[PDB]
Ligand binder design. Structure first.
Ligand SMILES: COc1cccc2onc(N)c12
Length: 126
């Protein structure tokens, strides 16, 4: 029923990097998805406000674009794959929790279509 602590966006002992691929994930990937008409995914799922008391019983690896945005802006990642995994976790969580055909599923699908289109053109490491 209650909301858990949000995913980590700051960890000073975690080693960090500022790479061209990570810059692409913020400037191109996150920015395209964030501006979209279907961008429920801009903050962690509020199970209390949205009345989803079983959400966190089912979803054990929560992820959202608000967390991803903070992670990219505060240079939390070491590599592009960590960020790509976060986006994939967010889409997977939506498909696992929600029933097939739901509005929220179609919203995640539209964002995922653009995500795959952008990741297809991930630049080579400089
Ligand atoms: C408004 O967001 C929702 C409403 C209902 C179910 C949901 O699952 N994942 C979400 N982001 C979500």
């Amino acid at each position: 029923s209650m909301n858990p602590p949000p995913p980590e966006t700051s960890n000073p002992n975690k080693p960090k990097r500022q790479t061209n691929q990570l810059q692409y994930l913020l400037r191109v990937v996150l920015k395209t998805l964030w501006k979209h008409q279907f961008a429920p995914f801009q903050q962690p799922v509020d199970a209390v406000k949205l009345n989803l008391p079983d959400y966190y019983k089912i979803i054990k690896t929560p992820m959202d674009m608000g967390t991803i945005k903070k992670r990219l802006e505060n240079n939390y990642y070491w590599n592009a794959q960590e960020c790509i995994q976060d986006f994939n976790t967010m889409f997977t969580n939506c498909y696992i929790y929600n029933k097939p055909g739901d509005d929220i599923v179609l919203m995640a699908e539209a964002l995922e279509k653009l995500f795959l289109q952008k990741i297809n053109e991930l630049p080579t490491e400089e």
